[PDB]
Amino acid sequence: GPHMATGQDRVVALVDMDCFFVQVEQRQNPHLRNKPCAVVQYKSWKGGGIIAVSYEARAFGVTRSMWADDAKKLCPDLLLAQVRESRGKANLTKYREASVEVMEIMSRFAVIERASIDEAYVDLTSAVQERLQKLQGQPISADLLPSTYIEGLPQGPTVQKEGMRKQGLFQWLDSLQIDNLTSPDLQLTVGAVIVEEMRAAIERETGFQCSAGISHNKVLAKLACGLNKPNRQTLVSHGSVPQLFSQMPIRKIRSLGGKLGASVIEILGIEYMGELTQFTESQLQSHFGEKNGSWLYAMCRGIEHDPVKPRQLPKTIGCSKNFPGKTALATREQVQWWLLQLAQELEERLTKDRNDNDRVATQLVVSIRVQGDKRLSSLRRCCALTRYDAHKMSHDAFTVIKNCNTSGIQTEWSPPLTMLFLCATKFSAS
DNA sequence: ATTATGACGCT
DNA sequence: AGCGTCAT
Ligand SMILES: Nc1nc2c(ncn2[C@H]2C[C@H](O)[C@@H](COP(=O)(O)OP(=O)(O)OP(=O)(O)O)O2)c(=O)[nH]1
Ligand SMILES: [Ca+2]
Ligand SMILES: [K+]
């Protein structure tokens, strides 16, 4: 009743760049704009592996993880842009730099949490209170929300997408109570106004379009963002959660798309997020652990407490390369050469990071995968990272992995290595 | 033979 | 610390 907290205390947005690497390449090369386009890594094996797909190409069934040769079967006119190769490996610097452009613009509006290269959460609670004070009771015009969808509307008693969007927005705005400065629905609405402004600034100042979700917490804002892509934003109110969740597959909620979500489905014999409400908190904790159980109990009611962390920079800077099938590394010369290639990329990135961000990494994590191991990492070892020197870094990595060589000969490496990974971690201010 | 990442939880 | 999960 009057005491049951409803998880409506914050305004959180999730901003996600549409098909981000494609947009980076389309900005650079206008011939790719408004075309079925994808970004690929490498080319010799089956045309390269697709990692990003324009919405025009998605209409033909092109997806990430597809080989370009197969994508071309679905879409013979598909245009391709290739990720840069440096020191024998994919080099994602162009996309990291473009991501910094976008994150710096978002940071003008509020403190952001960098969730990925192209995704950031925004805590808008304070900006919303300020904008509400500036308003002073004045209602919110639909013109301030020209790309906003209100999830679940229109409802109750046209045949074009934009017409439906406007019908729902009008129902939403008509039901608003713009007098109550503490009203969660009003706060969300002002949050959406701010996100329209943020998205307009990103597009004006970078050329990049994005989608966004606005809700009361990170999971709902993420879910909201996915409802109307591309180049649109979606408001998911607390009141919209029962209907939204009543047909929402559990796997769609961030963190439930893997083994844990599959076990929720199998153990409880349910399919949809809303079905979780029938279980007590103790029941859920009994099946899924204390933390997961409490999280599921609140999540299925629309409530989540995970804060938007003030962190605009990545916590780790890493470099990795697979050596699949017959390219696996089987000589000491080979292992050392590739460790050096990875370490030289890492040194370049770390040196730029130290100049830009006033910090230094102090730990080097070395990860490998041996041939025949189903796991992604067969072994991880840390050592001290005391100098930004690629030769020292690769010699240290070799030292921490050299005992894994089963071969009796020192020249040979067995079982061959199918992956090398160097990661700088544990940053300190400098 | 997807691949190059990056975050975070567990013990 | 080293490993596993999840994300994409
Ligand atoms: N190297 C590599 N990059 C990836 C992989 N998956 C995604 N990326 C990159 C390319 C994407 O443009 C970027 C952002 O990922 P997203 O999942 O947000 O998809 P994207 O932005 O392409 O499309 P969207 O409009 O958000 O559905 O991350 C991957 O498996 N390997
Ligand atoms: Ca994206
Ligand atoms: K993303």
Author numbering: -2 to 154, 160 to 432
Sentences from the paper on this structure:
DNA polymerase η (Pol η) is a Y-family polymerase involved in DNA translesion synthesis against UV-induced lesions. Despite their various biological roles and subunit compositions, all DNA polymerases contain similar active sites and catalyze the metal-ion dependent nucleotidyl transfer reaction via similar kinetic pathways. The A-site metal ion (Me2+A) bridges the primer 3′-OH and the substrate α-phosphate to promote deprotonation and nucleophilic attack, while the B-site metal ion (Me2+B) stabilizes the triphosphate motif of the incoming deoxynucleotide triphosphate (dNTP). Using X-ray time-resolved crystallography, we visualize the complete DNA misincorporation process catalyzed by DNA polymerase η.
